[PDB]
Amino acid sequence: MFESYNPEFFLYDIFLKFCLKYIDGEICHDLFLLLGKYNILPYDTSNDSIYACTNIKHLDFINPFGVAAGFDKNGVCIDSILKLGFSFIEIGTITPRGQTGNAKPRIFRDVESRSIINSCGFNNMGCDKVTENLILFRKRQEEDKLLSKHIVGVSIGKNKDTVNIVDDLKYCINKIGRYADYIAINVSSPNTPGLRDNQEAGKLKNIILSVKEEIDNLEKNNIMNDEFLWFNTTKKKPLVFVKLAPDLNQEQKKEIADVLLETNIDGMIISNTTTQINDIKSFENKKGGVSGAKLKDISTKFICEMYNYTNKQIPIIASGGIFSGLDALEKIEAGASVCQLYSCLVFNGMKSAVQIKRELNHLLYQRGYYNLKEAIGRKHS
Numbered sequence: 165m166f167e168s169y170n171p172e173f174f175l176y177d178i179f180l181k182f183c184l185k186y187i188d189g190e191i192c193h194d195l196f197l198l199l200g201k202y203n204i205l206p207y208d209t210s211n212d213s214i215y216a217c218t219n220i221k222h223l224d225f226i227n228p229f230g231v232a233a234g235f236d237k238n239g240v241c242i243d244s245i246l247k248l249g250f251s252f253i254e255i256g257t258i259t260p261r262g263q264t265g266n267a268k269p270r271i272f273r274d275v276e277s278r279s280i281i282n283s284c285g286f287n288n289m290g291c292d293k294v295t296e297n298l299i300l301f302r303k304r305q306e307e308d309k310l311l312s313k314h315i316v317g318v319s320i321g322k323n324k325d326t327v328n329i330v331d332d333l334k335y336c337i338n339k340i341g342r343y344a345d346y347i348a349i350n351v352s353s354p355n356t357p358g359l360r361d362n363q364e365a366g367k368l369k370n371i372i373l374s375v376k377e378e379i380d381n382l383e384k385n386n387i388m389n390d391e392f393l394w395f396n397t398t399k400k401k402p403l404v405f406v407k408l409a410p411d412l413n414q415e416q417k418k419e420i421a422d423v424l425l426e427t428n429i430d431g432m433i434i435s436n437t438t439t440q441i442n443d444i445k446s447f448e449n450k451k452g453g454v455s456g457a458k459l460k461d462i463s464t465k466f467i468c469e470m471y472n473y474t475n476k477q478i479p480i481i482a483s484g485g486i487f488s489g490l491d492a493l494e495k496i497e498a499g500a501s502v503c504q505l506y507s508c509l510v511f512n513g514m515k516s517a518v519q520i521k522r523e524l525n526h527l528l529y530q531r532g533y534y535n536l537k538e539a540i541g542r543k544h545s
């Protein structure tokens with residue numbers, strides 16, 4: 165009963181319920197990152213079921229659960245977070261220059277509804293410093309066989325005062341792209357003014373094509389170099405995903421889907437936080453995007469819509485209110501190939517990955533599936 169390396173060790177839940185009621189949200193988060201920075205977190209290095217693995221094109225996820233963007237904005241404890249049991253992490257969102265973000269306090273919890281509202285505003289150390297942090301992980305990954313198949317994506321955005329979003333996305337590609345297994349284009353943060361306008365079809369199309377061209381030029385101009393270009397897990401060109409906001413009318417969603425089909429995006433992350441929820445009186449006079457259990461149903465329906473609007477041709481990364489194995493299977497049967505957690509880590513703590521992986525495997529048994537891949541999109545028939 166001193167096996168503190170186990171993520172289900174009873175003391176973690178005790179400290180977490182105390183943090184939930186007494187300690188500011190962002191302070192809790194930085195404490196978590198500090199523990200990870202000094203390699204003090206517990207870990208689960210045990211073998212995941214081969215029957216729950218999954219892929220998005222050439223990305224082979226050893227299990228279906230990763231950590232959503234914004235949890236390690238700066239990529240300072242990638243190793244430790246992955247070793248909790250996750251198969252991947254999306255670091256960022258990063259911007260070309262660093263930013264302190266919007267005013268504090270700016271992260272608020274509501275345990276009753278297991279929901280969060282945040283107005284962070286892309287607080288990050290900037291692309292060049294996060295790149296150095298990612299490079300250090302990649303060098304450790306080379307020596308550590310036990311991280312050889314874990315995946316790291318990078319969410320990229322724009323500084324608050326940048327005029328043309330595309331300039332900032334290009335800068336991030338040219339510095340950090342060679343180290344990422346995939347790039348997530350963030351056009352859906354509710355906390356950078358004017359950012360969500362880039363989900364307009366014409367603007368979005370130009371953004372996607374510009375990003376893909378820059379990644380292609382990066383390879384075009386550098387694959388001949390002595391040092392092997394792709395210092396990442398896949399040893400290939402990063403795939404490109406788009407993260408969308410749930411707050412869109414049906415016409416926009418269809419017009420976006422048309423653009424995703426034409427531009428050949430490699431996947432879509434559905435979804436970001438919402439500004440549609442106001443029936444949480446603890447959040448009643450706060451600003452930003454709402455995460456957690458109150459976002460689950462909205463984003464699951466959104467997965468179903470974009471799965472159908474893209475005629476099942478665009479793989480889907482699920483994000484939004486995933487806490488349980490039942491939640492994960494709802495997302496997958498809705499059309500998702502992988503799931504991302506944030507709010508689950510806030511309210512369930514260290515045990516998040518180990519327990520949700522166990523619950524999913526039990527579900528795949530009880531529901532009669534041979535493997536997780538068989539369940540993808542099964543709601544639609």
Ligand SMILES: Cc1cc2nc3c(=O)[nH]c(=O)nc-3n(C[C@H](O)[C@H](O)[C@H](O)COP(=O)(O)O)c2cc1C
Nearest residue numbers: 232233234256257282436455456483484485506507
């Ligand atoms: C404090 C906080 C910070 C976040 N920062 C980012 C970010 O930088 N980039 C991004 O694409 N999403 C960000 N998100 C959104 C999450 O990645 C995720 O999409 C959202 O929380 C919904 O998932 P959940 O219900 O499991 O929390 C953030 C969410 C929270 C609560």
Ligand SMILES: Cn1nc(O)c(C(=O)O)c1COc1cccc(C(F)(F)F)c1
Nearest residue numbers: 179183189190192193195196510513514
């Ligand atoms: C509690 N809380 N509130 C937040 O806004 C966040 C966050 O990350 O956004 C968190 C997560 O923080 C911890 C989670 C598990 C365990 C611990 C502890 F440090 F207690 F072990 C902290």
Ligand SMILES: O=C(O)c1cc(=O)[nH]c(=O)[nH]1
Nearest residue numbers: 284285286353355437453
């Ligand atoms: O950093 C933020 O403010 C932020 C970015 C994002 O994409 N989603 C979110 O909820 N907050």
